[PDB]
């Protein structure tokens, strides 16, 4: 019973997680496109980060 309740509650916690009232982290250079994987000869879609 203890093990089953533990597993069920962990699944429930996975279904209803906990987070903060914050938006996603913002990274400057096209979400660090050049330094995460690289591939510079494709010129990906530029991303603009909001000022607030």
């Amino acid at each position: 019973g203890f093990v089953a309740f533990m597993l069920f509650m962990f699944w429930v916690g996975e279904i209803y997680p906990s987070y903060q009232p914050v938006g996603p982290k913002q990274y400057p250079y096209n979400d660090l496109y050049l330094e995460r994987g690289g591939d510079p000869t494709k010129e990906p879609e530029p991303v603009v980060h909001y000022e607030i």
Partner: protein, 124 residues
């Protein structure tokens, strides 16, 4: 948390999902839509090789904190101003993220209210 309680015990549509945020165009609120500024370029921030998750808009203060830590080495309590500056920059970043969260929440509430008003007008 109170947002967790309001979302899990209330309705889902009133509050956002952190995974898909934002769901609205940036300049939907106001049209000027200023751009965020960066100080450190590619080359020197790569040379300092900070970390992938540490390369955010607060990078310059981290660079100066590392410069202090390297320069005044034996006095490991010498440069405290730069630690405070980097903490303040990260505080501003987190505050802006919270403001973005609240802005998206208010936009969602306004959209829901507008849809309800349109439905009521159609019904009448």
């Amino acid at each position: 948390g109170a947002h967790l309680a309001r979302r899990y015990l209330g309705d889902a549509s009133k509050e956002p999902d952190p995974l898909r945020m934002p769901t609205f165009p940036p300049d939907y609120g106001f049209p000027e839509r200023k751009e965020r500024e960066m100080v450190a370029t590619q080359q020197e921030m790569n040379d300092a090789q900070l970390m992938l998750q540490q390369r955010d808009y607060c990078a310059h203060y981290l660079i100066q904190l590392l410069k202090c830590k390297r320069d005044s080495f034996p006095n490991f309590l010498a440069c405290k101003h730069e630690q405070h500056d980097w903490d303040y920059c990260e505080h501003l970043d987190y505050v802006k993220r919270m403001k973005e969260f609240e802005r998206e929440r208010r936009l969602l509430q306004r959209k829901k209210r507008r849809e309800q008003r349109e439905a009521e007008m159609a019904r009448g």
